[PDB]
mmCIF file of C-alpha atoms in Angstrom:
data_model
loop_
_atom_site.group_PDB
_atom_site.id
_atom_site.type_symbol
_atom_site.label_atom_id
_atom_site.label_comp_id
_atom_site.label_asym_id
_atom_site.label_seq_id
_atom_site.Cartn_x
_atom_site.Cartn_y
_atom_site.Cartn_z
ATOM 1 C CA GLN A 434 -8.882 25.269 31.692
ATOM 2 C CA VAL A 435 -5.314 23.642 32.339
ATOM 3 C CA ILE A 436 -6.848 20.208 33.453
ATOM 4 C CA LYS A 437 -9.233 20.242 30.088
ATOM 5 C CA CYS A 438 -5.839 20.938 28.111
ATOM 6 C CA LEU A 439 -3.871 18.259 29.828
ATOM 7 C CA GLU A 440 -6.751 15.747 29.157
ATOM 8 C CA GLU A 441 -7.004 16.745 25.383
ATOM 9 C CA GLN A 442 -3.056 16.292 25.388
ATOM 10 C CA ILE A 443 -3.005 12.927 26.913
ATOM 11 C CA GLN A 444 -5.912 11.783 24.670
ATOM 12 C CA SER A 445 -4.017 12.933 21.397
ATOM 13 C CA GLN A 446 -0.962 11.098 22.694
ATOM 14 C CA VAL A 447 -3.003 7.858 23.429
ATOM 15 C CA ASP A 448 -4.225 8.358 19.624
ATOM 16 C CA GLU A 449 -0.941 8.866 18.570
ATOM 17 C CA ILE A 450 0.065 5.666 19.981
ATOM 18 C CA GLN A 451 -2.664 3.638 18.956
ATOM 19 C CA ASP A 452 -1.917 4.954 15.413
ATOM 20 C CA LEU A 453 1.927 3.763 15.807
ATOM 21 C CA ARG A 454 0.467 0.686 16.959
ATOM 22 C CA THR A 455 -1.551 -0.094 13.949
ATOM 23 C CA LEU A 456 1.360 1.185 11.684
ATOM 24 C CA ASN A 457 3.547 -1.399 13.386
ATOM 25 C CA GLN A 458 1.132 -4.172 13.059
ATOM 26 C CA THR A 459 0.526 -3.748 9.510
ATOM 27 C CA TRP A 460 4.746 -3.459 9.033
ATOM 28 C CA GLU A 461 4.830 -6.667 11.004
ATOM 29 C CA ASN A 462 2.346 -8.581 8.454
ATOM 30 C CA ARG A 463 3.961 -7.124 5.889
ATOM 31 C CA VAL A 464 7.447 -8.520 7.218
ATOM 32 C CA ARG A 465 5.888 -11.901 8.125
ATOM 33 C CA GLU A 466 4.528 -12.119 4.542
ATOM 34 C CA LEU A 467 8.216 -11.171 2.987
ATOM 35 C CA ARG A 468 9.756 -13.521 5.326
ATOM 36 C CA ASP A 469 7.519 -16.801 4.142
ATOM 37 C CA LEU A 470 8.173 -15.617 0.836
ATOM 38 C CA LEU A 471 11.800 -15.726 1.026
ATOM 39 C CA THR A 472 11.567 -18.940 3.302
ATOM 40 C CA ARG A 473 9.474 -20.569 0.465
ATOM 41 C CA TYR A 474 11.899 -19.387 -2.217
ATOM 42 C CA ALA A 475 14.579 -20.935 -0.102
ATOM 43 C CA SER A 476 13.387 -24.476 -0.720
ATOM 44 C CA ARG A 477 13.014 -23.860 -4.326
ATOM 45 C CA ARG A 478 16.661 -22.515 -4.317
ATOM 46 C CA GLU A 479 17.977 -26.012 -2.627
ATOM 47 C CA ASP A 480 17.150 -28.038 -5.380
ATOM 48 C CA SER A 481 19.504 -26.637 -8.044
ATOM 49 C CA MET A 482 20.972 -27.415 -11.457
ATOM 50 C CA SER A 483 17.772 -29.188 -13.335
ATOM 51 C CA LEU A 484 19.400 -31.235 -16.014
ATOM 52 C CA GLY A 485 22.542 -33.185 -16.705
ATOM 53 C CA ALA A 486 22.162 -32.408 -20.581
ATOM 54 C CA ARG A 487 21.884 -28.646 -19.649
ATOM 55 C CA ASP A 488 25.511 -28.652 -18.578
ATOM 56 C CA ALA A 489 26.609 -29.756 -21.932
ATOM 57 C CA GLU A 490 24.164 -27.047 -23.330
ATOM 58 C CA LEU A 491 25.881 -24.535 -21.078
ATOM 59 C CA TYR A 492 28.539 -24.234 -23.596
ATOM 60 C CA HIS A 493 26.115 -23.619 -26.584
ATOM 61 C CA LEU A 494 24.027 -21.061 -24.745
ATOM 62 C CA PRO A 495 25.128 -17.619 -23.816
ATOM 63 C CA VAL A 496 27.686 -17.021 -21.087
ATOM 64 C CA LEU A 497 25.359 -14.449 -19.196
ATOM 65 C CA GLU A 498 22.697 -16.859 -18.866
ATOM 66 C CA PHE B 431 -2.922 15.249 44.308
ATOM 67 C CA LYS B 432 -4.226 17.145 41.121
ATOM 68 C CA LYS B 433 -0.448 17.973 40.492
ATOM 69 C CA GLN B 434 0.640 14.313 40.838
ATOM 70 C CA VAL B 435 -2.019 13.377 38.320
ATOM 71 C CA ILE B 436 -0.865 16.032 35.937
ATOM 72 C CA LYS B 437 2.956 14.899 36.294
ATOM 73 C CA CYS B 438 1.929 11.244 35.578
ATOM 74 C CA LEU B 439 -0.075 12.507 32.616
ATOM 75 C CA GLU B 440 2.903 14.714 31.180
ATOM 76 C CA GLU B 441 5.449 11.611 31.712
ATOM 77 C CA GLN B 442 2.953 9.447 29.888
ATOM 78 C CA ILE B 443 2.784 11.658 27.257
ATOM 79 C CA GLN B 444 6.342 12.029 26.941
ATOM 80 C CA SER B 445 6.873 8.169 27.174
ATOM 81 C CA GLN B 446 4.168 7.819 24.454
ATOM 82 C CA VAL B 447 6.178 10.400 22.197
ATOM 83 C CA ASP B 448 9.471 8.599 22.568
ATOM 84 C CA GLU B 449 7.461 5.001 22.058
#
């Protein structure tokens, strides 16, 4: 009785650990994808201020833009 | 013998919950 209950509890704990590991792996995959997207966005961010004319245009266009 | 195994299982379960 007691041995069976202890074994069942251990099995449940193992299942919980496996579920946690799967969740962690999914979280890690999501984090890696987000990091990759951010890293790619950084390269685009490095090149800044498209054209020389645009600076003159900046006066013409709205300030918020 | 049985008690030691039970203690190990309990410790493992507690560790698993913390993990």
